[PDB]
Amino acid sequence: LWERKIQLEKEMQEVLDDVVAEMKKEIHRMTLRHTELMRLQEKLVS
Amino acid sequence: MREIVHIQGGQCGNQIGAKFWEVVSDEHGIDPTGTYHGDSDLQLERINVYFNEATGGRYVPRAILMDLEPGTMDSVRSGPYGQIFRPDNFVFGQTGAGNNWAKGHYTEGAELIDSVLDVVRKEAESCDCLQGFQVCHSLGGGTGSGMGTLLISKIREEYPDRMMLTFSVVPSPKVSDTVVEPYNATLSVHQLVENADECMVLDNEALYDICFRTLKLTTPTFGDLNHLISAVMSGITCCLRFPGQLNADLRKLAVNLIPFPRLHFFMVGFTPLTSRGSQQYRALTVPELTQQMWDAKNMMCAADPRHGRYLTASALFRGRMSTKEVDEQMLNVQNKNSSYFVEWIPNNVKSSVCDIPPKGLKMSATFIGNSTAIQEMFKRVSEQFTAMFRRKAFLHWYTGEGMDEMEFTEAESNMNDLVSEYQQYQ
Amino acid sequence: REVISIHIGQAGIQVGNACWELYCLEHGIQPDGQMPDAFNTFFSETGAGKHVPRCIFLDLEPTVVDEVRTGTYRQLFHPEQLISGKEDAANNFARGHYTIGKEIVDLALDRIRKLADNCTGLQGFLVFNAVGGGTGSGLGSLLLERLSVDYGKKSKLGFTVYPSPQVSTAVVEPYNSVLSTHSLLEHTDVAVMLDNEAIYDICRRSLDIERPTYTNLNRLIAQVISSLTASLRFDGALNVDITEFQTNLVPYPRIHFMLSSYAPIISAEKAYHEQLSVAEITNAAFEPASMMVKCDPRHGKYMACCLMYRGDVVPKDVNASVATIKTKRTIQFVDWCPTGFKCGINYQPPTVVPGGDLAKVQRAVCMISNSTAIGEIFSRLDHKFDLMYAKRAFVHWYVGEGMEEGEFSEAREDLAALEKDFEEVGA
Amino acid sequence: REVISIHIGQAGIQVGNACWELYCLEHGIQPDGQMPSDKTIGGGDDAFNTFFSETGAGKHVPRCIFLDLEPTVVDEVRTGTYRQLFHPEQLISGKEDAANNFARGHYTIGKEIVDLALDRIRKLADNCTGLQGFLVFNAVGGGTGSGLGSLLLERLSVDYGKKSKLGFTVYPSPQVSTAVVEPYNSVLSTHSLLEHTDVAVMLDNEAIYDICRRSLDIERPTYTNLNRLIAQVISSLTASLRFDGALNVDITEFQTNLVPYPRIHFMLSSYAPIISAEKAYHEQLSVAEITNAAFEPASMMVKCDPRHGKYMACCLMYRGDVVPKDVNASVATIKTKRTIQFVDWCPTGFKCGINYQPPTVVPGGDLAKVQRAVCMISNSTAIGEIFSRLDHKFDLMYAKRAFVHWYVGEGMEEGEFSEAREDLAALEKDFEEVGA
Amino acid sequence: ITLELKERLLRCEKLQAKFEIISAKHRGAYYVIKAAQE
Amino acid sequence: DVPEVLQGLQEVTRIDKMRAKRAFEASLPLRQRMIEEWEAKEWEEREQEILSIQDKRLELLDNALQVREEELDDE
Ligand SMILES: Nc1nc2c(ncn2[C@@H]2O[C@H](COP(=O)(O)OP(=O)(O)OP(=O)(O)O)[C@@H](O)[C@H]2O)c(=O)[nH]1
Ligand SMILES: Nc1nc2c(ncn2[C@@H]2O[C@H](COP(=O)(O)OP(=O)(O)OP(=O)(O)O)[C@@H](O)[C@H]2O)c(=O)[nH]1
Ligand SMILES: Nc1nc2c(ncn2[C@@H]2O[C@H](COP(=O)(O)OP(=O)(O)O)[C@@H](O)[C@H]2O)c(=O)[nH]1
Ligand SMILES: [Mg+2]
Ligand SMILES: [Mg+2]
């Protein structure tokens, strides 16, 4: 029983933990694109 | 916090333990009456590992004497320092094993073991944290070999997570005093290899040679042999009672020494041993202590370590010292004698230091080796056992009392594979 | 601005024993905690006129901590920060980690929590242990994981007394060290190794000590830690903090093992005569004879070094000495580091510690480098681990404690991957 | 604004013996009913109004009724170190013992002593000018505390009625226990205590042992150790009337802001900081961590985890020099704290009383002189578990009619046994229906 | 036989401690739900 | 959507498990936790499989112990 519990825990904690890295890369790159949006606004001001 | 209970089996064990308490009580500063009258506080600071306070400064040792005669206990009480013991621990029969393993393990052992476990349980319950037991006995008698073996097996069936330091005075042939030593020694080591966890080999042959050569004594009685054994036994276990720069307790020593699950048979030394004429013409430097410590005519065993490799070794120094000096000394020893050390273990040697030396001696040390030369004593007893047993000499005294023939042969086989494992690893 | 000190095992506790007696006299605080704000990083004012150190001493065997309880600093520490187990770990990694560790590590964490609550502006942790034994290895590899999963974002400076090749008191060090260095690779952030044999040689040569005990060693490491934290305790013309140091040095996430050095490590008789200045103290620190880990800096290219100058040092002679050391061809920097020095300075001279042979000097340099020279360290310890593990020796104790036979293999492969990483980044 | 005290049973009279010493030390009264001649006064001539009364020449006498049947502890007090302080007549000692028997405590022997204590109570009340309320101190696990205490509670409710009552009662621990037949007395006294005592404060022997073991660093505590901090708690409760409080709460604030329903009055108590001399000056006592230790579950006089329930409401009495900003920030931190959870129907549930008097120190004690202290009285809903566990103990005993003949040999029937059972059941149902 | 039984009981206790310490180390499974939701 | 997503009683049972998982995935478009609770249910199914394997091995071991004890008694 204790062995089965340890096996369950190691499997469930190995599955606990990288596409979010690339998705957040997209988020930050689009934040840059909206800094470019602000640039467009200042071009409108000019 | 750590606790040790000390048990004495047989006459040899009783005498060795009596001298051991005579030594350790002084090293703690308490007089025979039981009232402390020493000087410092480093003594009293951790004496709870051996003694129990009774009523306002009356300290009683945690030891149990046990045998099958009243005469030995009467002698122990009549001797000095025998008052401290609690009279309740004095357990004994009246008949006597009579150097008979069957009496000491099957009849009298059975009829006394239930009583003795009561008192050992009392001591092991009055404490708070046990780390291991101590047993003092021989391997060439009835009250010491068979009864001590039964006692340690009964302990193992009760405390399966503890060590025992079983100090076994092995029956040496040239110092043999009874006609059937091997019929006891083989049948004792049978279960010593199974249950006890640190069997310390000792032999009257090596003790007498030490006394004759180094001490230069003229009339060495059993007093001085017990003195040396007690000094070793008190030095091995000062890492608990005293604070050192590098502290190493019993479990640490056991795990460091024992590489494989059944090679626990330690050969032991002690330094410095001097005559009172040459103690004025010598220097107790650390290299000198190490050289005497590895002097092959100083280990308390008849098996010369030159006849084999060292599985591992351990040194326990006492007195304010230099740890770098210790380590470089042992490194020099290993490098110079690299042919005596197992090849598949780098740095075969362990070192520990305690900041308190035994009183008088401003510096001291102890050696515990696990060399493969130990097989010499076992082959040297197996030869005698086979030689007797080929024609069943003295065998009816055991067969009629309850042992079949196959048990002796199984003991032979166990002794043979025990002595063969060391040869295999050498 | 705070770092809290946790000492584990006898080596760490005694190193802290020297370190705190150094700090108390450096700040002016008596043993029983009273003056006759620089202490705020280490000492916290409690009540009125009483100061308590931000430290916890922890061990399983009780007598080593009882030494502190019965010494001269008995009034100083919080009477509970001196934790004690009941039975020693017996130099067994499995026993220290699993069997005994559970009952006491939760207490350690629940005390670290209230220490951090008492603190406000914490930089992080500084931990002391040795990866040779069982206590400081198992308890270290468990407590570090606990802190890295609870606080996570803090920096844990681990000053580890790594075991030396030739001089070695224990016998299961090749196992204990690999079992510790599995975790120590990926749970702490900066691991300053120290080697007993190297510091023995330093004591023998510079201080002409032929019987160097642990006390002098411990004083030496205490001085190193004081030089590391002086930039935070005090002010200087060019300072350095934990984030400064720890993001300047560590190039890649899995390469952080400092080499430590100190100067002028000189006794009084030579310190009164021989003159001292930056342009020769810096070279003296770089010399292999005065590096604290039994390693060979010549074999490995240097990646990034950090220098700290206690005492009166103007920021120009340090620049000149950096030039005059980078101009020497014997030491080779790594190819991709066009600049490989981070210098910091202070305004306080090192405080001579009564009871030692260390000099009272005008200025001193503490050097912490990161270089590929340490590959042979791991390689040789792994070689002797292989020696012991070829015949499955000593495995029975760990197996009976609970550890299987395969985690040894996984940790060995982890060390092998570490060595491969060092070789790749050396290339 | 005087408050009178009633101590019933050996436990009650022992707590009083260990608590009136605290009062006579706080108000600088010598332990023989007088003040020292020299000016050694903290300040004021009426800080002792609530407990004593000058009679012609500086001879103060406490407003205490020490009522007990068996006279072995009453005369122990009579011959103790407090002889010229106590009133010779207030100390009421009967003839024989109650012997863990609610029957003998409430019907046989009680009836011939309640009307003797009642006249002294009436004289004390008539002497009093601004009477505030009653503070009862008793043990439900015994005979006199449970039986005589419940009888006196009923016969004071029938007479005065409107006045508030604060009942500090001890219960048996879930495991640690001394008396064998204590569940019967506990349930029988609980039925009477339910609808008569205005506010019930709970204490537990093991719940004070374990605090004295983990905090005060005593591995062999005793009753003379528990009673001292019980006196500390009651002093923290009553200091508002005594001393000048910037944000102070009279006795009726407890009932006004901590009893949302008249049935629900059962309250956990906590007190911080429980520190001794060794660690006192090494730790720093601040309104954040003292409050946090108050609301941790390891420092409650009632052995019960507040996790299983929801804090309905709470009161925090602060002594010493405390600035209200820090306590406001501290209760904000508590409201942001995750583990303890409130019933959503109470958005404001922290009363924060504050005084200007630091905690006192008694010579030979354990607690040291400190700046500030806090007493936390919480109306939670974890106490239903306590009542239910006590009831489950009671059921096994009552199933086999054990010990029942001793009870029924007196005026006690089995009808009141059953009605006390169903009253505890109704209390269980009420607490659970409060629920979410 | 009793010797063997005691050895097995000790092994069971060791595995118990191992499991509990692994639990304490990891948690200090309810994290994957919020991880995916984020 | 895709045919033959993966590339033998156990295998057949795995196929049925996969079909049921796709069915529940389509069924549920917190609501997501009800998928996570079924992940927990499949974990419990793995636990049952572990239980069965241990039962088989332990039964064999019990038989072996009976055999050794019988031989000992006979001798
Ligand atoms: N610098 C320094 N190192 C020490 C000291 N004591 C031990 N060591 C080192 O610690 C290494 C092994 O650790 P241990 O001696 O077993 O100490 P530990 O790790 O705490 O083990 P425990 O006895 O269980 O507490 C040795 O190789 C020594 O080099 C010391 O006092 N000072
Ligand atoms: N904390 C604390 N509890 C006490 C003390 N004295 C008695 N008790 C409690 O009182 C309970 C039993 O009630 P009793 O002490 O006998 O009081 P009683 O109601 O007067 O009973 P009788 O003396 O027989 O009339 C025990 O379970 C104790 O827990 C005390 O000094 N301190
Ligand atoms: N060191 C020491 N050994 C002894 C002493 N007396 C006997 N022996 C040894 O112990 C062995 C006898 O063991 P014994 O105590 O008689 O066991 P028993 O026969 O069961 O009682 C002999 O071989 C002796 O060499 C003694 O006083 N001191
Ligand atoms: Mg250690
Ligand atoms: Mg009573």
mmCIF file of C-alpha atoms in Angstrom, chain C residues 253-390:
data_model
loop_
_atom_site.group_PDB
_atom_site.id
_atom_site.type_symbol
_atom_site.label_atom_id
_atom_site.label_comp_id
_atom_site.label_asym_id
_atom_site.label_seq_id
_atom_site.Cartn_x
_atom_site.Cartn_y
_atom_site.Cartn_z
ATOM 1 C CA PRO C 253 21.409 28.995 -14.770
ATOM 2 C CA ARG C 254 23.368 25.785 -14.059
ATOM 3 C CA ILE C 255 26.909 27.196 -13.640
ATOM 4 C CA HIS C 256 27.359 28.712 -10.173
ATOM 5 C CA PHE C 257 30.220 27.461 -7.995
ATOM 6 C CA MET C 258 32.500 30.160 -6.607
ATOM 7 C CA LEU C 259 36.208 29.966 -5.847
ATOM 8 C CA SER C 260 37.042 32.064 -2.794
ATOM 9 C CA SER C 261 40.288 33.799 -1.882
ATOM 10 C CA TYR C 262 41.463 36.280 0.724
ATOM 11 C CA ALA C 263 44.371 38.649 1.308
ATOM 12 C CA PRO C 264 46.412 39.753 3.167
ATOM 13 C CA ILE C 265 46.332 36.482 5.101
ATOM 14 C CA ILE C 266 49.425 37.461 7.058
ATOM 15 C CA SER C 267 50.460 37.092 10.690
ATOM 16 C CA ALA C 268 51.550 40.013 12.854
ATOM 17 C CA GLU C 269 55.311 39.507 12.528
ATOM 18 C CA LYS C 270 55.232 39.575 8.722
ATOM 19 C CA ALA C 271 52.428 42.150 8.567
ATOM 20 C CA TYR C 272 54.434 44.687 10.565
ATOM 21 C CA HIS C 273 57.311 44.483 8.055
ATOM 22 C CA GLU C 274 56.036 43.617 4.577
ATOM 23 C CA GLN C 275 54.290 46.532 2.861
ATOM 24 C CA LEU C 276 50.785 46.257 1.436
ATOM 25 C CA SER C 277 48.987 47.888 -1.490
ATOM 26 C CA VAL C 278 46.250 47.099 -3.996
ATOM 27 C CA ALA C 279 48.487 46.458 -7.015
ATOM 28 C CA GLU C 280 50.114 43.488 -5.263
ATOM 29 C CA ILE C 281 47.267 42.358 -3.000
ATOM 30 C CA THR C 282 45.114 41.630 -6.108
ATOM 31 C CA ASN C 283 47.795 39.396 -7.734
ATOM 32 C CA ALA C 284 48.320 37.726 -4.308
ATOM 33 C CA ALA C 285 44.592 36.828 -4.188
ATOM 34 C CA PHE C 286 44.776 35.366 -7.749
ATOM 35 C CA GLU C 287 47.813 33.161 -6.910
ATOM 36 C CA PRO C 288 46.723 29.468 -6.703
ATOM 37 C CA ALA C 289 48.578 29.012 -3.363
ATOM 38 C CA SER C 290 45.920 31.272 -1.818
ATOM 39 C CA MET C 291 42.686 29.780 -3.164
ATOM 40 C CA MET C 292 40.407 28.022 -0.747
ATOM 41 C CA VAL C 293 39.338 24.985 -2.803
ATOM 42 C CA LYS C 294 41.751 22.209 -3.761
ATOM 43 C CA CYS C 295 41.526 23.152 -7.426
ATOM 44 C CA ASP C 296 43.894 24.279 -10.181
ATOM 45 C CA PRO C 297 42.953 27.675 -11.673
ATOM 46 C CA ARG C 298 45.602 27.299 -14.389
ATOM 47 C CA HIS C 299 43.797 24.432 -16.122
ATOM 48 C CA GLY C 300 40.432 26.217 -16.426
ATOM 49 C CA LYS C 301 39.713 29.532 -18.107
ATOM 50 C CA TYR C 302 38.259 32.236 -15.886
ATOM 51 C CA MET C 303 34.697 33.278 -16.662
ATOM 52 C CA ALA C 304 33.882 36.107 -14.243
ATOM 53 C CA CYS C 305 35.549 37.421 -11.090
ATOM 54 C CA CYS C 306 34.433 39.717 -8.281
ATOM 55 C CA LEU C 307 36.742 41.692 -6.000
ATOM 56 C CA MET C 308 35.962 43.392 -2.688
ATOM 57 C CA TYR C 309 38.303 45.860 -0.985
ATOM 58 C CA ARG C 310 37.761 46.530 2.695
ATOM 59 C CA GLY C 311 39.768 49.409 4.093
ATOM 60 C CA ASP C 312 41.039 52.643 2.601
ATOM 61 C CA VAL C 313 41.310 51.983 -1.139
ATOM 62 C CA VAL C 314 40.770 54.745 -3.696
ATOM 63 C CA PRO C 315 38.961 53.539 -6.853
ATOM 64 C CA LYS C 316 41.961 54.163 -9.152
ATOM 65 C CA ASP C 317 44.582 51.736 -7.857
ATOM 66 C CA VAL C 318 42.009 48.961 -8.184
ATOM 67 C CA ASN C 319 41.639 49.952 -11.849
ATOM 68 C CA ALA C 320 45.413 49.964 -12.289
ATOM 69 C CA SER C 321 45.758 46.563 -10.618
ATOM 70 C CA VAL C 322 42.959 45.104 -12.741
ATOM 71 C CA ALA C 323 44.893 46.308 -15.781
ATOM 72 C CA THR C 324 48.205 44.917 -14.498
ATOM 73 C CA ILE C 325 46.612 41.528 -13.777
ATOM 74 C CA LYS C 326 44.674 41.257 -17.037
ATOM 75 C CA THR C 327 47.976 41.996 -18.781
ATOM 76 C CA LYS C 328 49.515 38.766 -17.423
ATOM 77 C CA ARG C 329 49.316 35.800 -19.781
ATOM 78 C CA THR C 330 49.508 33.042 -17.149
ATOM 79 C CA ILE C 331 45.804 33.422 -16.272
ATOM 80 C CA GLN C 332 43.390 33.155 -19.192
ATOM 81 C CA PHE C 333 39.909 34.632 -19.187
ATOM 82 C CA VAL C 334 37.072 33.039 -21.113
ATOM 83 C CA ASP C 335 36.859 34.169 -24.729
ATOM 84 C CA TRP C 336 33.358 35.664 -24.581
ATOM 85 C CA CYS C 337 33.944 37.889 -21.517
ATOM 86 C CA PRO C 338 35.653 41.040 -22.849
ATOM 87 C CA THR C 339 35.407 42.444 -19.326
ATOM 88 C CA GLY C 340 35.448 39.939 -16.511
ATOM 89 C CA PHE C 341 35.836 41.929 -13.302
ATOM 90 C CA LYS C 342 33.346 43.396 -10.842
ATOM 91 C CA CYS C 343 35.067 45.550 -8.225
ATOM 92 C CA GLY C 344 33.602 46.811 -4.973
ATOM 93 C CA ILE C 345 35.129 48.911 -2.218
ATOM 94 C CA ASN C 346 34.399 49.829 1.401
ATOM 95 C CA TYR C 347 35.503 52.340 4.051
ATOM 96 C CA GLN C 348 36.023 50.031 7.003
ATOM 97 C CA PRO C 349 39.233 48.159 7.857
ATOM 98 C CA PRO C 350 39.022 44.503 8.894
ATOM 99 C CA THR C 351 38.592 44.170 12.649
ATOM 100 C CA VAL C 352 41.258 42.076 14.355
ATOM 101 C CA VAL C 353 39.571 39.234 16.245
ATOM 102 C CA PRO C 354 41.171 38.691 19.677
ATOM 103 C CA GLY C 355 42.190 35.088 20.170
ATOM 104 C CA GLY C 356 43.693 34.631 16.710
ATOM 105 C CA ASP C 357 46.870 35.191 14.726
ATOM 106 C CA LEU C 358 45.175 37.261 12.009
ATOM 107 C CA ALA C 359 46.718 40.683 11.518
ATOM 108 C CA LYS C 360 45.194 44.109 12.049
ATOM 109 C CA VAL C 361 45.618 45.538 8.566
ATOM 110 C CA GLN C 362 44.743 48.742 6.735
ATOM 111 C CA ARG C 363 43.116 47.036 3.749
ATOM 112 C CA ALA C 364 42.060 43.617 2.518
ATOM 113 C CA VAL C 365 40.770 41.930 -0.637
ATOM 114 C CA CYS C 366 38.162 39.181 -0.789
ATOM 115 C CA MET C 367 37.928 37.503 -4.197
ATOM 116 C CA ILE C 368 35.054 35.369 -5.475
ATOM 117 C CA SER C 369 35.565 33.960 -8.957
ATOM 118 C CA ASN C 370 33.636 31.736 -11.348
ATOM 119 C CA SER C 371 35.885 29.655 -13.585
ATOM 120 C CA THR C 372 35.862 26.347 -15.437
ATOM 121 C CA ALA C 373 38.807 25.078 -13.372
ATOM 122 C CA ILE C 374 36.453 23.211 -11.013
ATOM 123 C CA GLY C 375 35.598 20.489 -13.531
ATOM 124 C CA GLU C 376 38.330 18.207 -12.201
ATOM 125 C CA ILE C 377 36.811 18.545 -8.715
ATOM 126 C CA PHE C 378 33.522 16.967 -9.771
ATOM 127 C CA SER C 379 35.305 14.512 -12.063
ATOM 128 C CA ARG C 380 37.555 13.156 -9.313
ATOM 129 C CA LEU C 381 34.861 12.939 -6.647
ATOM 130 C CA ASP C 382 32.673 11.092 -9.151
ATOM 131 C CA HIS C 383 35.596 8.782 -9.912
ATOM 132 C CA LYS C 384 35.952 7.787 -6.263
ATOM 133 C CA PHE C 385 32.172 7.440 -6.005
ATOM 134 C CA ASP C 386 32.425 4.987 -8.900
ATOM 135 C CA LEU C 387 35.212 3.193 -7.026
ATOM 136 C CA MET C 388 32.947 2.699 -4.015
ATOM 137 C CA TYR C 389 29.789 1.959 -6.033
ATOM 138 C CA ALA C 390 31.327 -0.657 -8.338
#
